[PDB]
């Protein structure tokens, strides 16, 4: 099992995108997904002010600049991987479809309809 | 005890003592519309069930004993298994295909009873 | 006579003869939503009261005599004062803190009665 960095695609997919401190970061994760099987690691990041949200074309927004210095601390809680592939398999970061970021939290929930009427035999007569 | 649907895995005769627990749980313009549709629907669904109980002569009751005989072809089981072994979910699946037949028969026996009671007055 | 709430200052036993008077009075997109919310609410409030009367076995009645004993701890008064001296507003304040207890007891006596009536059939 080998890890590799992302495959070609646009910036919004090939990098780790997130919004923090009010600004949109595009970080290069190749330093995290470069290994066979299994200080600190520094990932360089790019910043954009013009943002095309989700996968839409036609609605762009301008992120106002944020005054001062931005520092964010967060918890990585999971990964979205895609398998590149019978003797070896390579996993790469993937995603870009935001539904998979919610699918990961809503997996425990199901919605059901209550149907309160029912009939059953009993030994009685009106 | 347990609240809403806490009896779901209990047997049919252990359950059906909690009928009031479930009965009471049936009760920017775009968000306003979605919320209203959810609320109107809850009301219409509630009223369809109440109308149907009214048609069958079971208005105002949670347990209604009728005069329709049970067909062994709907479920050939003895009361001991249905009420002491099975859960309501299992039962609902077992007789799903006969529900419309049963409902039709309940409507009909009520129409006859209701007319007979008029003739007696 | 007087219409809606005209009996509000009358004594409890002078009032309660006008129950149908009050019962019948319970029944640009933004304005449309506000009006609908007011109307949906009126319906939901109405139905919650009707559901509750149904649970207590009082469906279809304005005056419903039940089988729950009165606790002297809820209000230690004789019928003569409650019905001939007090108004309904005063009474509601007097026993406000026992309302939920009373409602719980009414629900329970109905569940028992309803089951006993099934066993008798």
């Amino acid at each position, epitope marked *: 099992i080998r890890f590799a960095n992302s495959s070609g695609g646009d910036l919004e997919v090939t990098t780790h995108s997130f919004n923090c401190g009010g600004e949109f970061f595009y970080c290069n994760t190749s330093g995290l997904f470069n290994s066979t099987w299994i200080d600190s690691i520094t990932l360089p990041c790019r910043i954009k002010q013009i943002i095309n949200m989700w996968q839409r074309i036609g609605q762009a927004m301008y992120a106002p600049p944020i005054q001062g210095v931005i520092r964010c601390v967060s918890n990585i809680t999971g990964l979205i991987l895609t398998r590149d592939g019978s003797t070896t398999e390579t996993f790469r970061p993937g995603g870009g479809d935001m539904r998979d970021n919610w699918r990961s939290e809503l997996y425990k929930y199901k919605v059901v309809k209550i149907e309160p009427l029912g009939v059953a035999p009993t*030994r*009685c007569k009106r | 005890f347990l609240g809403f649907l806490g009896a779901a895995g209990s047997t049919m*005769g252990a359950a059906s003592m909690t009928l009031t627990v479930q009965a009471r749980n049936l009760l920017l313009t775009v968000w306003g519309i979605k919320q209203l549709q959810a609320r109107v629907l809850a009301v219409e669904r509630y009223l369809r069930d109440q109308q149907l109980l009214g048609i069958w002569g079971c208005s105002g009751k949670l347990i209604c004993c009728t005069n329709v005989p049970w067909n062994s072809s709907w479920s050939n089981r003895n009361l001991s298994e249905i*009420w*002491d072994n099975m859960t309501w979910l299992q039962w609902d699946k077992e007789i799903s295909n006969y529900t419309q037949i049963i409902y039709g028969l309940l409507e009909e026996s009520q129409n006859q009873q209701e007319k007979n009671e008029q003739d007696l007055l | 006579f007087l219409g809606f709430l005209g009996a509000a200052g009358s004594t409890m036993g002078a009032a309660s003869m006008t129950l149908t008077v009050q019962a019948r009075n319970l029944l640009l997109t933004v304005w449309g939503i506000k009006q609908l919310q007011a109307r949906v609410l009126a319906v939901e409030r109405y139905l919650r009261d009707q559901q509750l009367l149904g649970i207590w076995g009082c469906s279809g009645k304005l005056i419903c005599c039940t089988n729950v004993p009165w606790n002297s701890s809820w209000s230690n008064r004789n019928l003569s004062e409650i019905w001939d001296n007090m108004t309904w507003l005063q009474w509601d304040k007097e026993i406000s803190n026992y309302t939920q207890i009373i409602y719980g007891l009414l629900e329970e006596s109905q569940n*028992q009665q309803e089951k*006993n009536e*099934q*066993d008798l059939l």
Partner: antibody
Amino acid sequence: EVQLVETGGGLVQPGGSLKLSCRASGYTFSSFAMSWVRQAPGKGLEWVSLINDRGGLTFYVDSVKGRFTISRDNSKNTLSLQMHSLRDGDTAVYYCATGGMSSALQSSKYYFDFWGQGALVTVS
Amino acid sequence: ALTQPPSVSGSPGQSVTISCTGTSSDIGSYNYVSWYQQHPGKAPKLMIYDVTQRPSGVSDRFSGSKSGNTASLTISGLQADDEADYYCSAYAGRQTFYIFGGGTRLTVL
């Protein structure tokens, strides 16, 4: 194996009262309806009273209807029968018996499955 | 109530029949006619219930049936251990729940 054990006094004067009881074991008490049956010293059996499994419904033979009370307590596994007024004609062995009715959601019985040995009650 | 006061008898190995006569709005219309066996000094035991059924623990020497307004209990391979009083009873509807007949003494010869 189940047991029904009748207890209670066996001697009263007419015009008085007497409480009998029946302790049950070996089965779920609360699942069965129960009755009392009299055996007159020189005759046969007579049904006197029946109580529902939950204690909600009670039935009596007309001859004791205004005098006897049948009660049940499912937490102690016991029945009780409270006799009042009492006549010489009420002398009998009073048997505790399991059965008599049904619970609606279960097959009916309408017969008596288990019997105790009986308390002897004499009205002098 | 129900009736059958005389004794019934036969020798070991002979069958005997015990009748129980009631009325239409009683034993005739309700198929709930149990039979009980009472050895003197003991509480009665259930032998037959409903009409033909027996409790587990009851031998097949005991069986029965009904017709019209009369029920009966049949004992086949009569034993000395069958010397007991037998009673029939029946569900007699609501209000009058149960009635019993007098018992019959079964004598083994």
